[PDB]
Each structure stands twice: as C-alpha cells, then as structure tokens.
Design an enzyme around this catalytic site. Structure first.
Site, PDB file in Angstrom:
ATOM      1  N   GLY A 178       0.862  -1.210   0.000  1.00  0.00           N
ATOM      2  CA  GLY A 178       0.000   0.000   0.000  1.00  0.00           C
ATOM      3  C   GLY A 178       0.877   1.231   0.000  1.00  0.00           C
ATOM      4  O   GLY A 178       2.109   1.156   0.153  1.00  0.00           O
ATOM      5  N   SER A 179       0.263   2.366  -0.176  1.00  0.00           N
ATOM      6  CA  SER A 179       1.022   3.597  -0.173  1.00  0.00           C
ATOM      7  C   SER A 179       0.071   4.643   0.280  1.00  0.00           C
ATOM      8  O   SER A 179      -1.089   4.443   0.110  1.00  0.00           O
ATOM      9  CB  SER A 179       1.556   3.915  -1.580  1.00  0.00           C
ATOM     10  N   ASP A 194      -5.535  -6.138   7.981  1.00  0.00           N
ATOM     11  CA  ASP A 194      -5.749  -4.959   8.800  1.00  0.00           C
ATOM     12  C   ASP A 194      -7.188  -4.944   9.239  1.00  0.00           C
ATOM     13  O   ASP A 194      -8.068  -5.598   8.635  1.00  0.00           O
ATOM     14  CB  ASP A 194      -5.267  -3.661   8.131  1.00  0.00           C
ATOM     15  N   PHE A 227       1.883   7.721   4.846  1.00  0.00           N
ATOM     16  CA  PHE A 227       3.044   6.947   5.378  1.00  0.00           C
ATOM     17  C   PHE A 227       4.189   6.558   4.391  1.00  0.00           C
ATOM     18  O   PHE A 227       5.172   5.940   4.817  1.00  0.00           O
ATOM     19  CB  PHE A 227       2.563   5.639   6.003  1.00  0.00           C
ATOM     20  N   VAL A 229       4.794   0.929   1.085  1.00  0.00           N
ATOM     21  CA  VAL A 229       5.205  -0.221   1.871  1.00  0.00           C
ATOM     22  C   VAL A 229       5.163  -1.452   0.992  1.00  0.00           C
ATOM     23  O   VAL A 229       4.124  -1.711   0.388  1.00  0.00           O
ATOM     24  CB  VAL A 229       4.268  -0.484   3.089  1.00  0.00           C
ATOM     25  N   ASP A 277      -2.889   8.487  16.009  1.00  0.00           N
ATOM     26  CA  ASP A 277      -3.706   8.066  14.846  1.00  0.00           C
ATOM     27  C   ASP A 277      -4.233   6.659  15.004  1.00  0.00           C
ATOM     28  O   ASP A 277      -4.168   5.797  14.110  1.00  0.00           O
ATOM     29  CB  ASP A 277      -2.881   8.210  13.547  1.00  0.00           C
TER      30      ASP A 277
HETATM   31  C1  LIG Z   1      -5.664   0.541   4.030  1.00  0.00           C
HETATM   32  C2  LIG Z   1      -5.157  -0.910   4.202  1.00  0.00           C
HETATM   33  N1  LIG Z   1      -4.394  -1.535   3.109  1.00  0.00           N
HETATM   34  C3  LIG Z   1      -5.031  -1.673   1.795  1.00  0.00           C
HETATM   35  C4  LIG Z   1      -4.387  -2.839   0.966  1.00  0.00           C
HETATM   36  C5  LIG Z   1      -3.152  -0.686   2.843  1.00  0.00           C
HETATM   37  C6  LIG Z   1      -1.934  -1.273   3.617  1.00  0.00           C
HETATM   38  C7  LIG Z   1      -1.452  -0.311   4.692  1.00  0.00           C
HETATM   39  C8  LIG Z   1      -0.639  -1.083   5.781  1.00  0.00           C
HETATM   40  C9  LIG Z   1       0.819  -1.210   5.423  1.00  0.00           C
HETATM   41  N2  LIG Z   1       1.654  -1.182   6.731  1.00  0.00           N
HETATM   42  C10 LIG Z   1       2.091   0.001   7.263  1.00  0.00           C
HETATM   43  C11 LIG Z   1       1.526   1.247   6.946  1.00  0.00           C
HETATM   44  C12 LIG Z   1       2.044   2.431   7.492  1.00  0.00           C
HETATM   45  C13 LIG Z   1       3.119   2.458   8.373  1.00  0.00           C
HETATM   46  C14 LIG Z   1       3.664   1.228   8.710  1.00  0.00           C
HETATM   47  C15 LIG Z   1       3.174   0.048   8.157  1.00  0.00           C
HETATM   48  O1  LIG Z   1       3.752  -1.145   8.481  1.00  0.00           O
HETATM   49  C16 LIG Z   1       3.271  -2.333   7.993  1.00  0.00           C
HETATM   50  C17 LIG Z   1       3.922  -3.466   8.401  1.00  0.00           C
HETATM   51  C18 LIG Z   1       3.475  -4.635   7.978  1.00  0.00           C
HETATM   52  C19 LIG Z   1       2.430  -4.666   7.102  1.00  0.00           C
HETATM   53 CL1  LIG Z   1       1.894  -6.216   6.628  1.00  0.00          CL
HETATM   54  C20 LIG Z   1       1.766  -3.556   6.622  1.00  0.00           C
HETATM   55  C21 LIG Z   1       2.197  -2.334   7.124  1.00  0.00           C
END
Ligand SMILES: CCN(CC)CCCCCN1c2ccccc2Oc2ccc(Cl)cc21
Length: 273
Positions: free
Chosen positions: A13-14, A96, A17, A20, A135
C-alpha cells in the site's frame, strides 16, 4: 547493503506513510515490510543515541520496539540520498482491521472485547515507552490471523508523550476529539481515549459514529446496530465531550464490559479459524 539483505516483494500500500512493500530477510527468510519515505515529505525530525538526523518516526519506533508488545517493531532502517527506508515486522497471514471489518461487518462483542483489550495493552505500552501514537484507528491495526494477535502500525503522526498541551495534529480527523475541532488544543492521553471510543464503536457497529465536525462537537452517539448496555456505556464514556469526564486506561480496563477477555489464541480458534 539494503538490496543485498532483503528480497523485495509486492507493494502492500502507499499513502501519507510512504510506500510499503512485502519483503523477505535473506539471512533467515523472516517476513518483513519495507517502507520508503522521501525526505522532502518528512516534516518531523528528531535525533539518535549517537545523534544523527532521522525522521521522528524512527525515534518513536525505536522507543517502542524493545521487548515484545502489540506494536509492529522496527527491525532496521536505511538512509538513501532522497529517502529513508524502514524494515518492519510483517505477520503472515495478516489483515488490517479496516479490511477485516469491511469484509465481515460489525464484530460480535466477544471478538471486539478481545481486540479492544489488545489495543489498550499496546497503547499502554507506547505510553510507558514515552510515545503518543495520535492516529489510533482500524487501518492502523493489523491482525495476525493465526495467533489472534493485534499489532499497531504507523507512528508517522505520533509524538513524544508529554503532559503539556498539543497544538498540532496530523492524525485522522474523524477520530480527533472535539477539543481539537474547537480549540486546536488537546492533551495526549485523553485525546487517545476519545480515539479509542471511536474505534470501539467502529468495531461493534461496523462503521464510525461521526462524519462531520458538528457531529463530533455535538458528541451524541446513535447505535445503528444492537449493542449491549454495558458496551454502549463504555463507548459514551470514552466519548465524553469534556476531556476530564473520559475514563483513564485503568478505568476502561476495569469497566464491566471489559471482564473475562479471551486470550489471543482462543480468539483466533473461535473467530478467525
Ligand atoms: C488501508 C489498508 N491496506 C489496503 C491494501 C493498505 C496497507 C497499509 C498497511 C501497510 N503497513 C504500514 C503502513 C504504514 C506504516 C507502517 C506500516 O507497516 C506495515 C507493516 C506490515 C504490514 Cl503487513 C503492513 C504495514
């Protein structure tokens, strides 16, 4: 050495933050998440033990990543010329809480209870470490689906915990307390408790209670879904308009709705397998 030590996978995702990616640590095949942020998109900076210039997110993550907790831990970080790269834990399989609730609808109270408890434990941890998240919400909570264990992510709007007033906020608006909406002023803990009321409502109702600023300030809570008098009371307590009328973490955790929580593993057997 960053490209040597980690095998990059799909983009997860992006957003605010950064971006990622799914990753594997080549050392021992540890699942990881690789998060990139461009330097010019960093407004918040702090400093290390050895005292180099880093994003505040790194300072905050370091402070909470010692020992075990309900927080996704910072395993390593790298500076590049134009970006910082952070290596984070990645549970597998994982979903999530936003997605979980979107897919499965409002949570049974037994499940909300387990989840909400683990959030409270994680937020107390951060508080003890001297970190304010700022948050707390469904999208910032990951569920380890096999272990039934919840993990907080995204310290990008967080700050050092202090006892004086905060007059900046860049968390999520619909989880922000009425005192912020009205005065651009809040203290840490009681704003955290408000966010936790929003999250609990979200859990048991399947959506958030307030959309517009005037609803936040009005603070009247309506249930669209059948929710027990005890859970309703806890929620309306967390969502007291006056910060001083909100419960402390202790009072939330001693509330009668919160008694007899399932352990994480049992929670996964019952609700997640
Ligand atoms: C809105 C949910 N999702 C849609 C596909 C977007 C993914 C956002 C979470 C990414 N995230 C994440 C997002 C923002 C800051 C730290 C993060 O650390 C992670 C560590 C492990 C995993 Cl598996 C994922 C994260």
């Amino acid at each position: 050495p960053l490209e040597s030590q980690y095998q990059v996978g799909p983009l997860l995702g992006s957003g605010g933050f950064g971006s990622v990616y799914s990753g594997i640590r080549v050392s021992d095949n540890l699942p990881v998440a690789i998060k990139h942020v461009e330097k010019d998109r960093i407004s918040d900076w702090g400093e290390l033990p050895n005292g180099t210039r880093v994003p505040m997110e790194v300072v905050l993550l370091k402070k909470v990543s010692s020992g075990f907790s309900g927080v996704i831990r910072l395993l390593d970080w790298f500076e590049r010329p134009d970006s910082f790269v952070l290596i984070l834990e990645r549970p597998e399989p994982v979903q999530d809480l936003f997605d979980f609730i979107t897919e499965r609808g409002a949570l049974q109270e037994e499940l909300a209870r387990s989840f909400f408890w683990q959030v409270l434990e994680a937020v107390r941890h951060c508080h003890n470490c001297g970190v304010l998240h700022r948050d707390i919400k469904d999208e910032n909570i990951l569920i380890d689906l096999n272990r039934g264990e919840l993990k907080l992510i995204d310290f990008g709007s967080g700050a050092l915990l202090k006892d004086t007033v905060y007059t900046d906020f860049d968390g999520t608006r619909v989880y922000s307390p009425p005192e912020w909406i009205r005065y651009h002023r809040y203290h840490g803990r009681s704003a955290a408790v408000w966010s936790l009321g929003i999250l609990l409502y979200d859990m048991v109702c399947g959506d958030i209670p307030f959309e517009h600023d005037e609803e936040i300030i009005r603070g009247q809570v309506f249930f669209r879904q059948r929710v027990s008098s005890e859970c309703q009371h806890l929620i309306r307590w967390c969502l007291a308009l006056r910060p001083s009328d909100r419960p402390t973490f202790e009072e939330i955790q001693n509330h009668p709705w919160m008694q007899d929580v399932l352990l994480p593993q049992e929670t996964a057997e019952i609700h997640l397998h």
